[PDB]
Write a protein that binds this DNA or RNA. Structure first.
Length: 560
RNA sequence: UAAUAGCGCCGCAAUUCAUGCUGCUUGCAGCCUCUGAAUUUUGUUAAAUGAGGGUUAGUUUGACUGUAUAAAUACAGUCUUGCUUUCUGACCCUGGUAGCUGCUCACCCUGAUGCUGCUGUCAAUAGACAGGAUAGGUGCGCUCCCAGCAAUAAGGGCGCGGAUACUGCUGUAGUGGCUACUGAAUCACCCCCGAUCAAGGGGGAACCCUAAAUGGGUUGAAAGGAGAAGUCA
DNA sequence: TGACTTCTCAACCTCCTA
DNA sequence: TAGGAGGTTC
């Protein structure tokens, strides 16, 4: 899985864009709005929230009686299926948050009604917690996924209270056979949250085209690349890309022509194009929306398919997941009419997958993960690295933040200054204020990408097999402890001065964005081929020592 | 006149070290000369930082094929489109006229993450006019500090009216926001005519090659994953 | 507004036209 | 015969 997206503006006639704006802003988004509302008031909605799996076909079923509606008609099949898909996945994320809120409220009402304190536990249930806690401990600690699911399932007052007590007490050899505070705070926090939940119980949507061939490519008489989409072939758009992204688009036309010249003996499905959104960006100025906003294509390209050697890897992934799909469907005896069509399409792909298109030749680097580049995140130094051997105990080479961001350091300093300025402005914004993006930029993202590129390049230089990153959850405790450590480093025991310096430090050296950095490193390493493991950053020590010990802890846990 | 102190940065040291340097002794010995790391420690007649607002489908970071090359990388060949960004420059500016609106003010007192703070010129009024990013303080900034103002922090006091949730003492008066039209730059060696849902076309200069031929070249660089939704603050 | 979190990332088989 | 648009699916 190395999916990446390229983009290119689409230029066409005004009449060619008035059709696309009206078709989408007036008919396709309202279909998504109505499909979202209907999926919410569906009777089975609370059944879905209990699970994480909205049914495969439900969003489609609510759309078939909606395609013929007076206000949702005239949409191309791809436009309709895109809207359905939009409702499934846009409303997917929507109802995911929905069942978080709705089902959390339901559980809080329920836990409030059932879970109780130690005193009420003794009064109603009255079971000795040590005995049942130790029994459950010897049941689970002595595939524990089944046991954790069982804990997730047990809801009776005594059973849920005792199993949660065992889970939160350490579920292990703890000499303190105490702390009814576990389910006490459980019920208390539940009551507070149920109180809260009792009190509180201009751009159209994109066009996801899940089929690669729904975009048909052609070369203009001037040599420019052109696109027209399935369902709208009278609408022709010209690809205004950049030369860096051009070799993808020339690959699209070449790949499509190659399938044509073989009389569809080639499997679109090894295409370097997987799908493509068709969004409208936002323009500055005035005017009818089609003349202001720039239509933009967002093609998702599996970068692994570019090389011929990489294609065989994809050729092996699909030929394995699909031959399993066949066997999974071959055990059933239902033998539906259109089901056998689906069965038919599968063996068609297997036969069509062994016909190779011309792709470049690359000896994909083989990575031995024994080397462990360890990356340490903090406040004073935003990020430091340590290339350390694990079989030995020597550090091959450290690099600090001033040394990974070559010529990008002034960027870090001015980004810290900007993050100070923007935070002061947001605090000054109070509750009533104009939009707070005034003066904001994506300098933080540029730095979080420059840093990931350098870290991965350093890993590749030393043949590193893995890059180790701190768990993002432990990034508030770590920064708080680093502030404390700096405080006692400056003021030894003068507590007043320590607090004052902590305040003044938080004023200037703001918290970094340790989510975009971990995500950008995950993207870059995955693109290059370096697997990423996660360890536990040590609480104290010098940043270089913290990085080295993180890297070693990662290997120690890998040994398990 | 004053900016003390604090806090963050950035050098500059100084020391200790290796991820260095050096030596083979090949994992030890030195060394700090570069490169870093880690302290602390100054703010030099200075080193490096450096935050008023804007302007380019700017340039550079590119693809394929071949060669050298294990690779990188180099070189040659062929192609080239303008996306979204981060810088570095260069340049422009310190806006106007119209409307529509928001807030805040009887009067005190403290003083906020409050506002203001440039150079001349003419006043010395409170404002012009010229300049203009060097712009109160420190090497450089700050919510810190200094100076004025402070009704537009919050709190306290407290006069008269009307009401008996709260009002009035309030002038565009001061500061905001919005829209519409306008002012300048509209760029990447420079200049001119143009495109800007598309368009480039010309004309110079320096330099290099070349004696010399708009003969050719060259006249800043980098990075990519985008959409949607929800939650927290 | 910032920060976080979740999700998204087809494909050949038809029938139709030229 | 060679595309274009629709169809359907866990």
């Amino acid at each position: 899985a190395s999916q990446i997206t390229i983009q290119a503006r689409l230029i066409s006639f005004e009449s060619n864009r008035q059709q696309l704006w009206k078709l989408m802003a007036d008919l396709n988004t309202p279909l998504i709005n109505e499909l979202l509302c209907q999926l919410g008031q569906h009777p089975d909605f609370e059944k879905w929230q209990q699970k994480g799996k909205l049914p495969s076909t439900v969003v489609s079923q609510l759309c078939q009686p909606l395609k013929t509606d007076p206000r949702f008609a005239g949409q191309p099949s791809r436009l309709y299926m895109s809207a359905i898909h939009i409702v499934d996945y846009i409303y997917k994320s929507w109802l995911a948050i929905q069942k978080r809120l709705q089902q959390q409220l339901d559980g809080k009402t329920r836990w409030l009604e059932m879970l109780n304190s130690d005193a009420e536990l003794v009064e109603l249930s009255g079971d000795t917690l040590e005995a049942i806690r130790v029994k459950a401990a010897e049941i689970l600690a002595i595939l524990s996924k089944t046991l954790f699911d069982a804990y997730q399932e047990t809801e009776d007052i005594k059973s849920r209270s005792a199993i949660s007590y065992l889970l939160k007490n350490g579920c292990k050899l703890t000499d303190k056979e105490e702390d009814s505070e576990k389910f006490a705070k459980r019920r208390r926090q539940v009551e507070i949250q149920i109180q809260r939940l009792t009190e509180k119980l201009s751009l159209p949507f994109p066009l996801v085209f899940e089929t690669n061939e729904d975009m048909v490519w052609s070369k203009n008489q001037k040599g420019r690349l052109c696109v027209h989409f399935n369902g709208l072939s009278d609408l022709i758009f010209e690809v205004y890309c950049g030369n860096r992204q051009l070799h993808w688009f020339q690959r699209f036309l070449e790949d499509q022509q190659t399938k044509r010249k073989s009389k569809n003996q080639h499997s679109s499905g090894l295409f370097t194009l997987r799908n493509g959104h068709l969004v409208w960006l936002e323009g500055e100025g005035k005017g009818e929306p089609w003349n202001l906003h720039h239509l933009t294509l967002y093609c998702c390209v599996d970068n692994r398919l570019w090389t011929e050697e990489g294609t065989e890897i994809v050729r092996q992934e699909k030929a394995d997941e699909i031959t399993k799909f066949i066997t999974n469907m071959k055990k059933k005896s239902d033998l539906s009419d259109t089901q056998q069509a689906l069965i038919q399409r599968k063996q068609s792909t297997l036969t069509r997958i062994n016909n190779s298109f011309e792709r470049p030749s690359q000896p994909l680097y083989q990575g031995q993960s024994h080397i462990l580049v360890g990356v340490s995140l903090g406040l004073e130094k935003p990020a430091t690295v340590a290339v350390v051997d694990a079989i030995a105990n020597k550090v091959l080479a450290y690099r600090s933040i001033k040394q990974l961001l070559g010529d990008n350091y002034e960027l870090l300093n001015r980004q810290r200054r900007q993050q100070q300025y923007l935070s002061h402005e947001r605090h000054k914004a109070q509750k009533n204020f104009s939009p707070n993006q005034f003066g904001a930029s994506e300098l933080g993202q540029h730095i979080d990408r420059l840093l990931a590129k350098a870290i991965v390049a350093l890993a590749r230089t030393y043949k590193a097999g893995s890059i180790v990153l701190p768990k993002l959850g432990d990034m508030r405790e770590v920064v708080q402890s680093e502030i404390q450590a700096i405080a006692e480093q400056k003021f030894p025991g003068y507590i007043e001065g320590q607090q004052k310096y902590a305040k003044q430090y938080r004023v200037n050296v703001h918290r970094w964005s340790y989510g975009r950095l971990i995500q950008s490193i995950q993207s870059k390493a995955a693109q290059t081929g370096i697997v990423i493991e996660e360890g536990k950053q040590p609480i104290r020590g010098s940043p270089h020592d913290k990085a080295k010990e993180l890297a070693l802890s990662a290997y120690n846990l890998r040994l398990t």
